[PDB]
Amino acid sequence: MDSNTVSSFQVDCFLWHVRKQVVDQELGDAPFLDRLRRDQKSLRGRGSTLGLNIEAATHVGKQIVEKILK
Amino acid sequence: MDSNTVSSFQVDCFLWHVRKQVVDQELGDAPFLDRLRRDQKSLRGRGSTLGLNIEAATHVGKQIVEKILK
């Protein structure tokens, strides 16, 4: 497992969480919702394959993105 | 143009900008880079179709996401 495969997954988990909040705020259109559903399935499969816990990865992804937004 | 189609595009523009910064920080793997390239093409087409300026939309997307991260 390369370091970058791990950081890529972490980021994608956190961005998925942000997109889910946009949908819970009723700001997403139909195709945005469809991408959210498809990506959740994809992320779970990648998480299974890598053996990475999704909640843990989501939290590291948040830290990576906060570092970047600074 | 529905309100939600606009907020969905704004969010997607800003998240694309975040993903681009992850790649500039050398944190992305090959498939992460491939999704970045594919999505840039898709976003430009959606921006053209809607008549929305991508830089403007990116900045509103940032505000939407900051509201959510609070």
Side-chain angles (χ1 to χ4, degrees):
Chain A
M1 205 179 287
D2 301 324
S3 183
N4 283 10
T5 291
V6 181
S7 50
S8 294
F9 179 79
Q10 292 163 327
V11 166
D12 276 346
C13 280
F14 177 61
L15 297 190
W16 191 86
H17 170 79
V18 175
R19 286 154 59 201
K20 167 79 163 127
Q21 301 316 300
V22 164
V23 161
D24 285 350
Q25 290 288 291
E26 303 179 29
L27 293 178
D29 66 0
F32 187 92
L33 219 95
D34 189 52
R35 292 185 292 274
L36 186 82
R37 293 198 280 244
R38 282 191 228 219
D39 289 347
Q40 177 166 36
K41 298 329 148 280
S42 188
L43 275 173
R44 289 243 151 224
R46 283 160 68 193
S48 226
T49 300
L50 303 169
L52 280 177
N53 175 298
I54 283 171
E55 299 288 324
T58 298
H59 287 302
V60 179
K62 177 158 74 261
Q63 297 157 16
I64 284 168
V65 169
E66 282 182 351
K67 283 187 224 104
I68 289 194
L69 284 181
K70 198 195 88 65
Chain B
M1 205 179 287
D2 301 324
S3 183
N4 283 10
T5 291
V6 181
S7 50
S8 294
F9 179 79
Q10 292 163 327
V11 166
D12 276 346
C13 280
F14 177 61
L15 297 190
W16 191 86
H17 170 79
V18 175
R19 286 154 59 201
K20 167 79 163 127
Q21 301 316 300
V22 164
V23 161
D24 285 350
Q25 290 288 291
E26 303 179 29
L27 293 178
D29 66 0
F32 187 92
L33 219 95
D34 189 52
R35 292 185 292 274
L36 186 82
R37 293 198 280 244
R38 282 191 228 219
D39 289 347
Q40 177 166 36
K41 298 329 148 280
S42 188
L43 275 173
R44 289 243 151 224
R46 283 160 68 193
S48 226
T49 300
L50 303 169
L52 280 177
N53 175 298
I54 283 171
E55 299 288 324
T58 298
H59 287 302
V60 179
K62 177 158 74 261
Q63 297 157 16
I64 284 168
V65 169
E66 282 182 351
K67 283 187 224 104
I68 289 194
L69 284 181
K70 198 195 88 65

